[PDB]
Design a protein around this ligand. Structure first.
Ligand SMILES: O=C(O)[C@H](Cc1ccc(-c2ccccc2)cc1)Oc1ccc(-c2ccccc2)cc1
Lengths: 268, 267
């Protein structure tokens, strides 16, 4: 019966809300300006950056850079802390996924290990528009151009994201939809090291049906969306892959940089 | 209307047959399956390879392994020769997919250029099983072991395909299913340099609709088969991408040989 999928649809949207403070909806309301209830301070140049710390809560170094942790770093390190906070949230959302907490704990760990970032970059799409990405719970907004215009081993970090995001937001999906999609991303099974695929495959199979229907109802006039959406899961894999190697480059550049353990562990 | 799709699917099935000599069905019967009416010649040992040129018309080389060109290469350069026949077999099939031709000539070429490797490794899983892959018009059968016992680079070459294949075959798809699947791969749409996507996506949307029903009316007991088949295309995009990585190193090997250029152009 569908009614059960719809109920499952309802269940996941409900945990999504409880788990993530900045829903795509809050985010877009901030970007589309129209609803100028609260607009973001815009960081487009080093000048703005220093200013931003003033306007927004930035415990980083506002004044001089180079000799005391340059900008490129503080932004990257500032970025680090956000992923972690992202991981704690996604981890929190997984638990609410029917059947996820009853899987071999080892598996649960593997699913989060490989799922976290494809999910991080999908949610990130929600905070991005052709020209930039919201930061600090939406209080700020940092330009795509300003980001691309960063140092050699740091300016190449976001561009690929933006590209995936521009074509992804293209599908015009909303939170109710992402809720299930990230759930499907989590219960993969092609993950290296899994011990009991079938039980995992058995849940994802239920999620997908839930998605199929969700996309059908939420997007009638949108032909073949479900099919186009699953294919998007391929763009992610690449992004991650490019993300880790470019990441390795850093390890060598600045051996004085420290990768947050919760992230150091996840990577492999 | 389900009538037009059922038609489209049959149309594609009919074409796929005329274009592809060795069908899964065929290869299957032959493989680990029985149907032993003409058992295929096996190549499990460095010695079974040699003497394999006697029967099994190989249009590319004679058996000679003794300080006179290595085996790994002779085999590697064989997979190529065959893939090139493949490309042609695919080009014909591509040209029978409704709308395909009425597409910008540059778009057709682009679609073909990037979607050919994925189509191959998909069809290669037809001729494979966890123990080995069917060779030469299905006349032969080279062992997985042997391929894994090849040269250093040439070693971790086919393995990633054997693993993809095992998992792909698990889906237990038939030629009627594969036929529509191949088309969907071709008419992708997110290919670099395309000029006019709309017509492309429009035809794929249609092929995706066709595939869905196809799988519905042939694997009912199967669940979310469509979804799972679609997420297999990512494992494909990966096989091919990782295949240029193990192929880029080959350039750093056998290429600069004064006597062999007219052959380098062919590939
Ligand atoms: O983290 C974010 O919210 C954004 C988008 C983003 C970018 C990259 C990732 C990322 C995810 C996993 C590993 C590495 C990076 C995750 C999110 O990137 C930012 C970069 C800098 C800042 C920033 C924070 C404080 C002061 C100045 C800039 C904010 C966001």
């Amino acid at each position: 019966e569908s009614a059960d999928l719809r109920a499952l649809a309802k269940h996941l949207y409900d945990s999504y809300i409880k788990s993530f403070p900045l829903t795509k909806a809050k985010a877009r309301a901030i970007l589309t300006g129209k609803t100028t209830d609260k607009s973001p301070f815009v960081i487009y140049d080093m000048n703005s950056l220093m200013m931003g710390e003033d306007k927004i809560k930035f415990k980083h170094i506002t004044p001089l850079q180079e000799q005391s942790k340059e900008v490129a770093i503080r932004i990257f390190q500032g970025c680090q802390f956000r992923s972690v906070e992202a991981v704690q949230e996604i981890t929190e959302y997984a638990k609410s996924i029917p059947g996820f907490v009853n899987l071999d704990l080892n598996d649960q760990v593997t699913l989060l290990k490989y799922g976290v970032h494809e999910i991080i970059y999908t949610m990130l799409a929600s905070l991005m528009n052709k020209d930039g990405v919201l930061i600090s719970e939406g209080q700020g907004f940092m330009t795509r151009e300003f980001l691309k215009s960063l140092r050699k081993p740091f300016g190449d970090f976001m561009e690929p994201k933006f590209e995936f995001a521009v074509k992804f937001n293209a599908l015009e999906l909303d939170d109710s939809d992402l809720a299930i999609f990230i759930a499907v991303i989590i219960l993969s099974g092609d993950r290296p090291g899994l011990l009991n695929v079938k039980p995992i495959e058995d849940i994802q199979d239920n999620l997908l049906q839930a998605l199929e229907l969700q996309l059908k109802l939420n997007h009638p006039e949108s032909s073949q969306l479900f099919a186009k959406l699953l294919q998007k899961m391929t763009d992610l894999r690449q992004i991650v892959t490019e993300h880790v190697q470019l990441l390795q480059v850093i390890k060598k550049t600045e051996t004085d940089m420290s990768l947050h353990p919760l992230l150091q562990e996840i990577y492999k």
